[PDB]
Design a protein around this ligand. Structure first.
Ligand SMILES: CC1=N[C@@H]2[C@@H](O)[C@H](O)[C@@H](CO)O[C@@H]2S1
Ligand SMILES: CC1=N[C@@H]2[C@@H](O)[C@H](O)[C@@H](CO)O[C@@H]2S1
Lengths: 572, 572
């Protein structure tokens, strides 16, 4: 039947009241109240510059929205795709099953791309935009988006779609009447790491992930595509790696599938950044090559962080021929990325020391067999691997390594340099390594495990109890985790942050819940770096969760819906 | 392309080996190896009596499976529906996208229902069955299921479907050749509680839940349909309760929808058991009746366990007219249930003491205003509510109450009796209340919160941190939680157990992950009460997870699939 309630703004809270017939005051639907009762309405993330939403809503005709591209260029196809996608975005205001009345004003959306040829991802790219909405004539609306690039422009389209509300009391589609917004992200790298080697993820699920990322302006999909458990990446030059390495013949990422994901990303302002983790975290796929050591080594606890063990043998010249080929095949299909992730996490000394061929190589080259001499071998590997990476991508490009024994700030300059290597941090946000690295001029991607590890909290996957980084990290904690606080005066060296979904206990079935809506908390933190805390964003976070669900995302539930309908009553 | 590996059984573990062409030994697919390498093959739950799977598999034609009902009766429609559903179940052995070769033997399934008129749920119902599979003639298979009732018979069909394996090396559908199984559950009550008031669950999602329950022989769906947050139950006699109480007009459970769920349950051996929680856990829907107190009382911490507060006013005679009507409407559509849950959790004394009309009632009836006098008021309420319940269902039937101040074993006999009231336990499995209740002759449903609360572990929903009963309970812990251990010599008084999905932080989007595959661990514990621990069931648990995923259930991921393919290598 019909909705029985109405909402009224009182001290920044929409209070549910009986919609009693004996009243001359127009009843407000829940979302209509929220749009003006909340400081930033229903927007997520909130803008960084002008955020003027005015006071009124206008009824609009869904079938009368026209998008006009005013400046043509090389991004024509991307702008046209983004425009076509806009009506679809607007319909997300309308709950499934409900139908708006096809009456009201026509909306003219004007897209002004200041540099219409620009379509490359880069850390220096301009993601800023201006958004203005105002009445136009008697019967229409003028929505104008102005941006320096396509990427800023499609962010602007995202924000604009959030300015539509469905009045489910009257069945009207509404739009904010008077809008002045200026906006740009605080950090250029706003990412999610997806491990697709510990478990397989359907390419459908990967695209869906990119859809939700774009909804909250996340711009980087870090595809951790290989590990010791599987090799799903289809390398044409070294086909045995995926043939032996895949969990099944269908659990694979073909060139055509990767091209699809990469293009799907590009259209949505998301760079797809591949990782080949080396020289640890290899195993499956490398059988019969003699290019690994310790694969499935037992007892595993003596040789690696988690089963199965397995590491590359850096002493074999043929290895770098394989690496060159893998990197070249990656470069071919991951052709929007400006950066390459080379892993470098958790290298085992004990594993390398257990190999005869490796020991013979070190003794003959005048190195000892102690813990620090294996760091020489690691450098030897990384330098040669690095060379192949540059050759593959046809240029010098920034490379990423995880924090590790190698990247210890005390000796990092012996092996790496700050211009060539970005460091992905997965220590606590308080670990001494962060300041030490920043003082040496290094650029960081923040993935501190106490706030940004989305896999934490579930049961143990080896033995019993809970997994290693438990407890489960609530959105409140990921929201309050501030790179500006962690880095202080060196904050410009922080390129941004990344939520990590390791997949020992996640796959196609669970990725919607793992990522959403928690990655939206990171999205606002990185977009706006608010001085305010999670409580000030709580109401808008509850709304963005509902929006993801309307998109078809199986997002985690945060609170009873009663709390969403009754702001202020659920607190501690 | 084609699968490259084969598996060989070694010390109870399927080890992955190269399927090398220069071999005279037939290569075994992963599942084919598991079926005979594991003590109980791919079965879940494992049988309680005979569990003879023989040594061989036969190739069968998918399109040549014929089900024959040998004894007709009143359950004809249920038997025919269960039979029609069998082909569908068999196809769950085949991974999506794969096609079996339409060659091999024909399968004749013979269904022998010993009492074909019997279709009532009861704690005394016979869920036993016998399963025999053997070759028949030259080109067919004889699968015979013999059971004392329809319910035992459909359990037998479930087990039988698990005896099919897809060989993905050869693309053959296989079936265990020689089977002798006898089986019956240790406990008659094997349940899941679904709270659909703290958040709404689509009826599609509820049916899907019943599908997965039936797959592992769970037989009781405890529908916690109302609470203080919402009233989605469509009561025709008191329509304002759902009109004011529902989260939206579409977030409702109509008579037709409930009849659908109840029938869907019946066909699958699942009783749908409704709960009307009283006299606490009421609120939304009751506005303008003056039949509640403390609704939305602030500060909530002084008046209830969680917001919003709200309790029935037992002093109003009209209340029991409402209750009679609600219970009668429930009885009409929940017409397969043999038991009624009346809640009785977490009654607030402070809430009742804050009411003038309540205080006046107690002072005039010679009761004090101290903590124990409110227990008199609670008894007064429960007795009258109980009377209405019996009237509604047209008979005396067992009633369930939660453990609470009322059900404290020390005084429980003053208020309740063991014949009329079943107690649902949500204390720790070690709490003194359990033994005290059992020694007084009480029957229990085990839902101890340290092992059976499926909501635990996530972020806080009020304030920050994690929810109240964190950490997250892994399947290992729910598996090892034994009612036989908890109850000892009084174990026949344990009717069984129930996994509780409270929904402050769960809805349509998350229920597959919340319940599965963890509720399968409860399913085996309650079906078989194994003396063995979780490690002995680990491999079969990993398989049942995959089966749920094939069913379209978005089940939680337990381990890297690599571990499933490489038994023994993932341990701690
Ligand atoms: C860098 C890192 N390398 C490891 C990953 O391989 C695991 O999957 C993850 C699980 O939390 O832990 C650390 S983070
Ligand atoms: C009986 C019980 N009553 C309460 C429920 O209303 C909550 O939803 C649940 C959350 O874990 O905690 C206890 S259990």
């Amino acid at each position: 039947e019909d909705v029985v309630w109405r909402w009224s703004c009182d001290n920044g809270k929409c209070v549910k009241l009986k919609n009693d017939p004996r009243s001359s005051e127009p009843a407000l639907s829940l979302e209509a109240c929220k749009m003006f009762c909340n400081e930033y309405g229903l927007l997520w993330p909130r803008p960084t510059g002008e955020a003027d939403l005015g006071n009124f809503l206008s009824k609009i005709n869904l079938n009368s929205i026209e998008v006009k591209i005013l400046k043509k260029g090389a991004t024509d196809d991307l702008m046209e795709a983004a425009a076509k996608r806009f009506k679809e975005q607007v319909s997300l205001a309308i709950p499934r099953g409900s139908t708006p009345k096809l009456t009201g004003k026509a909306v003219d959306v004007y897209l002004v791309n200041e540099n219409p040829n620009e379509k490359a991802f880069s850390l220096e790219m301009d993601e800023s935009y201006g958004l203005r909405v105002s009445p136009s004539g008697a019967d229409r609306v003028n929505a104008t988006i102005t941006a320096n690039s396509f990427f800023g422009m499609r962010h602007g389209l995202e924000t604009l779609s959030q300015l539509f509300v469905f009045d489910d009391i009257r069945d009207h589609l509404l739009m904010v009447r008077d809008v002045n917004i200026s906006d740009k992200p605080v950090y250029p790298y706003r990412g999610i790491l997806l491990d697709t080697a510990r478990n397989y993820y359907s390419i459908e699920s990967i695209k869906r992930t990119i859809e939700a990322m774009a909804a909250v302006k996340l711009n980087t999909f870090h595809w951790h595509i290989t590990d010791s458990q599987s090799f799903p990446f289809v390398t044409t030059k070294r086909p045995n790696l995926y043939k032996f390495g895949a969990l099944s013949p269908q659990k694979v990422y073909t060139k055509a599938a990767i091209r699809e994901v990469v293009r799907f990303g590009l259209e949505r302002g998301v760079r797809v950044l591949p990782e080949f983790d080396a020289p640890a975290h290899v195993g499956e796929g490398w059988q019969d090559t003699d290019l690994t050591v310790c694969f499935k080594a037992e007892p595993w606890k003596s040789y690696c962080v988690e089963p199965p063990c397995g590491q590359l043998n850096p002493t074999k010249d043929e290895l770098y021929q394989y690496l060159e080929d893998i990197y070249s095949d990656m470069a071919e299909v991951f052709d929007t990325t400006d950066i390459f992730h080379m892993g470098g996490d958790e290298v085992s000394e004990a594993c390398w020391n257990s190999s005869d061929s490796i020991q013979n190589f070190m003794m003959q080259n005048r190195w000892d067999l102690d813990k620090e001499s294996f760091l020489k071998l690691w450098n030897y590997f990384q330098q040669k691997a690095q060379d192949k990476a540059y050759k593959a991508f046809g240029k010098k490009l920034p490379l990423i390594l995880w924090t590790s024994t190698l990247t210890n700030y005390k000796h990092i300059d012996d092996y790496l340099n700050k211009d060539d290597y970005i460091i992905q941090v997965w220590t606590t946000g308080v670990d001494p390594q962060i300041k030490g690295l920043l003082e040496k001029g290094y650029r960081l991607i923040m993935s501190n495990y106490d706030a940004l590890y989305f896999d934490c909290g579930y049961g143990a996957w080896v033995g019993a109890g809970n997994n290693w980084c438990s407890p489960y990290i609530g959105w409140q904690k990921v929201y309050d985790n501030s790179p500006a606080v962690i880095a202080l005066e060196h904050r410009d060296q922080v390129l941004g942050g990344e939520a990590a979904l390791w997949s020992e206990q996640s796959d196609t079935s669970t990725l919607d819940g793992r990522l959403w809506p928690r990655a939206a908390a990171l999205a606002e933190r990185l977009w706006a770096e608010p001085a305010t805390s999670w409580q000030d964003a709580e109401y808008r976070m509850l709304h963005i969760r509902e929006r993801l669900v309307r998109m078809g995302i199986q997002a985690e539930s945060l609170q009873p819906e009663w709390c969403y309908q009754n702001e202020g009553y659920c607190y501690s």
